[PDB]
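Q: I have three molecules that I believe assemble together. Could you output structure tokens for the complex as a whole instead of separate predictions?
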Amino acid sequence: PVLWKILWGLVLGAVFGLIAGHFGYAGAVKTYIKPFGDLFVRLLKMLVMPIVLASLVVGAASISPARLGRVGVKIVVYYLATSAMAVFFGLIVGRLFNVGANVNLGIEAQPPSLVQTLLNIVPTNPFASLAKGEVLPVIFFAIILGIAITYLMNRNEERVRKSAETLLRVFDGLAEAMYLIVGGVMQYAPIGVFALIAYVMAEQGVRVVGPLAKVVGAVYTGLFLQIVITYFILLKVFGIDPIKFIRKAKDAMITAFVTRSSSGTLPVTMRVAEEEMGVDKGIFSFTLPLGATINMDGTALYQGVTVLFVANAIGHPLTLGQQLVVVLTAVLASIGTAGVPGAGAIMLAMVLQSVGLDLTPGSPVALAYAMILGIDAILDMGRTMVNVTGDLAGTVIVAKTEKELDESKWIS
Amino acid sequence: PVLWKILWGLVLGAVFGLIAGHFGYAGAVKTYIKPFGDLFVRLLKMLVMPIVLASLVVGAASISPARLGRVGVKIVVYYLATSAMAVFFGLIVGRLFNVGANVNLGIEAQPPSLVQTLLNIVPTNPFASLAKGEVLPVIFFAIILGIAITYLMNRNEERVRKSAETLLRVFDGLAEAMYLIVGGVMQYAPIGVFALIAYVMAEQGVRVVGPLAKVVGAVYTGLFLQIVITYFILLKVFGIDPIKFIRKAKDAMITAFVTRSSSGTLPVTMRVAEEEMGVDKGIFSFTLPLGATINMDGTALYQGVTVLFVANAIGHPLTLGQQLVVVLTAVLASIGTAGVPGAGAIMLAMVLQSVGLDLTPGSPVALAYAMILGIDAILDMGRTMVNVTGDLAGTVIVAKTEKELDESKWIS
Amino acid sequence: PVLWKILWGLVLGAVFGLIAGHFGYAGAVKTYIKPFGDLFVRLLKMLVMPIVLASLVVGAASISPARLGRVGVKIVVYYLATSAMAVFFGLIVGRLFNVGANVNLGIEAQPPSLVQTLLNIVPTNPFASLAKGEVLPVIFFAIILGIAITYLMNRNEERVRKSAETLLRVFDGLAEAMYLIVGGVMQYAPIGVFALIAYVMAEQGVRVVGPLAKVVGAVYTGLFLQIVITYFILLKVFGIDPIKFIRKAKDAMITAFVTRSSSGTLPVTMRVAEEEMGVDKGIFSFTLPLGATINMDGTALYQGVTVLFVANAIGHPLTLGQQLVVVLTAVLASIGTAGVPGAGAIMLAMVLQSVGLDLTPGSPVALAYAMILGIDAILDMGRTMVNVTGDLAGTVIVAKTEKELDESKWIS
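A: Yes, here they are, computed for all three components at once.
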């Protein structure tokens, strides 16, 4: 029927892509197939700022300031727990696979800018932040507007109440229109998913062999553990069926895989949280856009594995604690950056630079980095998918502890 | 009375401009007169994005998706027909006038980027497209919002209906305010039109003599034919009186002439389509902003004539078919570019470059190009005016075939 | 209680700052204290465009076009009167203090661009002006929208009336939400004020000694006169108690002092004009944002004193008339620039350049300029505070002459 059509799009696309690439034809795919996926991506991007704004004004109106504060602190604690596990599994699986058994030849400290990152949460011109697509300051402004609106709707004067209600309905109507449009785009999603996975498989799939296959294997094993261990256990502890959860998350998960953007998947993730998970807008309109920018699980996994791979390729000895400190400094440097393709590759290059390594052409390290860079898309797909999964899990969890989860949705 | 005041502004301005230029005083005109016209232009530009957005959300709400699809395909077929005629008349009149009987001395292929032009129709951030004034993605977003809004207003739940109605009324109120403001600016239009035509006549009017006069004559003859043949015949075939049509179009036509921008005339063109032509908002809020960016009649005319002029000035033999292929490649390269001053001059320079010509200082071709460049404003006025005329004709025509034209407006 | 808490924040901050700087610790202040003030500044900046837009649409709706015209002309006449006095006091106090009795060693004319400044009042894309935070074109668009809205709400057709009312309520709700939020931020203001004055005192306070102290003394004396003479007399003549006025202005005045931005203080200035002064929105939503950008009192004072200081430091003879012409050309060059930190320092550098002086490293003039530059923050605080004071005075005055001032607010 319509349901699961996306999982067919993905599976069918990946096979076609592999075959096309193996036979030389990845160029034709780039020309003919890929535009359909680019279209899918654009259609979803179009929706990010309107749906995030309107949903959070409405959601933050629907809920008390207090409850919003608890949601903020609960979801941040969740992302700390889950990133700690992601660091663990990055270190473990990287070493189990022993990434980097090939042979090559074989000092920078910068101040912490988090004070300014926090200050930068506050927009100086909210129209500018909407036009530039900066999510976190829009979150801030939407929240304050929602709060203000509900304070005014309880005020005595009818003019203020009627004005506030009109404003809130304008945002409610926009949100509704966006959710409807998301549904329509998701009628198209299978074609887009096919086209995207096809292009990726044809270009970089053929390259996963030998050592790099163990890197890919290693990375994907880490994600797997993060899901079936960290997310499942957390869900069961709080009384959510993790298999039901996964079934409901599937459209968001596959979209995350192919689009390689947490923010670009947001309209889908939010529709899944509303229609499938049964989370109230007061929760997910806040937790989900926030988690799209602060979730550090995929980064911890990527850095743990690729840092080990690089160190071993150049024969540089790396202790588990030294790997841990390096991964942690990369994670701290990464916070606040939303999900974007080719991100972690850049961050890895930075991490290597900051520890005092020669990236000049011809160097061993430049070589190992280029090797990662060439499978980076394959790694990014997995990175984004595990992050969006963790976002849905944490949203659902927080919603449950707040009694904002509709239970009828969870029972066969 | 007030009506026809604009045609007096134009006529009076052009005479004053010619006289001032002939007597040396074009500098004083630039200083003292021109700012009033720049003001006219800015006041109209101010209105483009609000009126286009609100009118298309409302219009697309007022109408079924199906009807909107038919309007899309009908108006595109119209622009293909009319550009084919414009190519014809460009070739014909250019050769009849034998442009370029003066004597001078006397290889680049680039891939087609239309796939990406189409993809670029979809905005990735609609707030950004509003802030940057990109019309076609705003068209896309407005249409989808209108559709979504009407789907929601038929939904059962009263909260959704009331929210959707509030949102639609906000857009309706904005549109109404814009149309009212347009009316006010058009109280000022005669002064602006005077100032603009005055400046243009004083600076470049004095230069239309000898060979360049035949170029101007040639270009203006082509436009004339395009109107009295292509537009009139199309109007009569579908049962619109072309003389009544022209009478109603006059304010939009003159504004197009002086402002040299299809988009910058839009608030006027839309008010003319509503008040005078009697076209429903469901049609013109879509056809007119679209036609302002895809209409290729003025370009076909300009390229046909100026390409012939250049080829003859340098004594390069040019067959009718070779001229046709060149003009066609310029038109294909031009699609999607909205009406902007100094556009076609740039495109001509590109066309010359792409065929393998030396534009370096002192070269014959650099010389012929500079000669066109110096009358380019005079040519742009006509180019924009014929495009806006064709836009109104096609809007009216499409509206008639859809039974969206109010007939009481058409009968003395 | 809560009231006057800001004046404690200021006083306490300035003492802590001076002590910290005198003992070496200004670096720790920059690190630990200053971010709280930067936060204060950002929170206020966030509100400028929403509150200015919504208040002026509503205000301009509430009032007739005629009354708005009178408000425009009355407030401009006020700023001319008060800048003339500011020029006077700049010249007087500069010479009384005899700034520049230290000893050093010891031709550019550019056309007037005011025509284009005026043209630039009209936005070509109002969404762009909102996103870029350009106040004056937003003023223009809001006014025209307000006018249009009220014309439509008197129209016969109920659809137009209901649409216009919905649009106006959306703006009214937004304004209300902003004013509520301002109130909340002002709960935080004492901490921000403390942090800001602390940082400024620790960095540049210790440097006010010797000659530069006489410059600071001189500048602050001029501001003082401008207040207790120009503003007080104007207030008494029109029957406003100037001591009551000052008491009501205090929160806006202190915020202006520490933030060093007329525009950045606007949400506070407008809340003070509404809650304290009792000015109708029809007046202050227009006069206050306008006065924030056209008020030239602080500039006249700064230029008069610093120009004299520079001339005397290099032993260049400067007659009172020559000083006057110089200050006047700086004021004309400054009009239209809103209040921004480090502005006048730049303008002084320009003024020196335009009169034909050598600013190359090592030069006497480069030296005197650097000396001013090092206390410039201390001078900017005072400049901004006197401007915002004059803005409130003129708003109140204009409101009184229009019978838009609520008198119950003015009686103990």
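A: One point stands out. The two ends of chain C are 19 Å apart (CA to CA).
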